[PDB]
Write a structure and sequence with these properties.
310 residues, TIM Barrel, eight-stranded parallel beta barrel, two-stranded antiparallel ribbon, binds alpha-D-glucopyranose, glycosidase, signal, cellulase activity
């Protein structure tokens, strides 16, 4: 039961976006209904990645205790996901203070994972932990390389062998993969995110400032495919050198991009990842990058097939 076998269990997955990583669940548009996981399994996904903003559910002061009600909610969500025979990834996501002052908030992340690891320690091996989403800014490659092992150390005290996913630093952009220093732990998976070209995938996304213009195409030209292949080969050669499996944790193009381009970009990214033995998770389930319409109760096609491969 090696890290590579567990990586294959992640397989082709999907992110439950705009839910538990909002300040409050539902305030970004998605409340996780129990049936969503049955719906996700039924379509053919192997896994679900669940972004969680734990940092908005803890006391301001030490020992940064996680709200009991929030913790039981997450427990319930995990329970239902696992009962639907999915692999489940829970993370810490959008810890804004960590990006600004990691020397101060690094110990807070440790305490958060102390508590989450303790609550989930007896869960089946199909639940994975992911220490942090997209280290960046003040949480530099170097500080991340210092911080993550300490959180991992803490996790290992109660969960000796559970799969733990380590994000690439600098927003987990592919090109920073070589900056990540690896530990001796043999039950880890390295994760990067892919949104290239950013002016395609995030065109018209109001949350980017300035808002990128729309009308950007992705056409599947040989040169366009090759861009993607070269980026992933770079991740691939590093990973093989270091004997670590790779998880493409997020990839997607915003719905304000033209559908034809989205289908081509999405299917190309998925195929290239499969080619390098990367597991993957589409961003995201049902909102602005979404594959599933909650109201019409239908998966958008062929985009969903482009994301999933079936
Ligand atoms: O990543 C942050 C933002 O992403 C997207 O814009 C979501 O629609 C929004 O809910 C969130 O504020
Ligand atoms: O979630 C934060 C996002 O925007 C950032 O600029 C990163 O470069 C990108 O990898 C990520 O998707
Ligand atoms: O969908 C809203 C945004 O924030 C999320 O955390 C995603 O990771 C990123 O890809 C996107 O830009």
């Amino acid at each position: 039961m090696s890290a590579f076998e567990y990586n294959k269990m992640i397989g082709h997955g999907i992110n439950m976006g705009n839910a538990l990583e909002a300040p409050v669940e539902g305030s970004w548009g998605v409340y996780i209904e129990d049936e969503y996981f049955k719906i996700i399994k039924e379509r053919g996904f192997d896994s679900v990645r669940i972004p969680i903003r734990w940092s908005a559910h803890i006391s301001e002061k030490y020992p940064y205790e996680i709200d009991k009600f929030f913790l039981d909610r997450v427990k319930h969500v995990v329970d239902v996901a696992l009962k639907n025979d999915l692999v489940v990834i829970i993370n810490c996501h959008h810890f804004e203070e960590l990006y600004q002052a990691p020397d101060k908030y690094g110990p807070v992340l440790v305490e958060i994972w102390k508590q989450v690891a303790q609550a989930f320690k007896d869960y089946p091996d199909k639940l994975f932990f992911e220490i942090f989403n997209e280290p960046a800014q003040n949480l530099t490659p170097t500080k991340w390389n210092e911080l993550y092992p300490k959180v991992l150390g803490e996790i290992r005290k109660t969960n000796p062998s559970r799969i733990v996913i380590i994000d690439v630093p600098n927003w987990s952009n592919y090109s920073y993969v070589r900056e990540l220093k690896l530990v001796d732990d043999k039950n880890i998976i390295v994760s990067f995110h892919y949104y290239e070209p950013f002016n395609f995938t995030h065109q018209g996304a109001e949350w980017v400032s300035p808002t990128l213009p729309i009308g950007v195409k992705w056409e599947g030209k040989d040169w366009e495919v090759e861009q993607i292949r070269n980026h992933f080969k770079y991740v691939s050669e590093w990973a093989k050198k270091n004997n670590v499996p790779i998880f493409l944790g997020e990839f997607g193009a915003y719905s304000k991009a033209d559908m034809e381009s989205r289908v081509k970009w999405t299917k190309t990214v998925r195929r290239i990842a499969e080619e390098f033995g990367f597991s993957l998770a589409y961003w995201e389930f049902c909102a602005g990058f979404g594959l599933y319409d909650r109201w019409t109760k239908t998966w958008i096609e062929p985009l969903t097939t482009s994301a999933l491969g079936k």
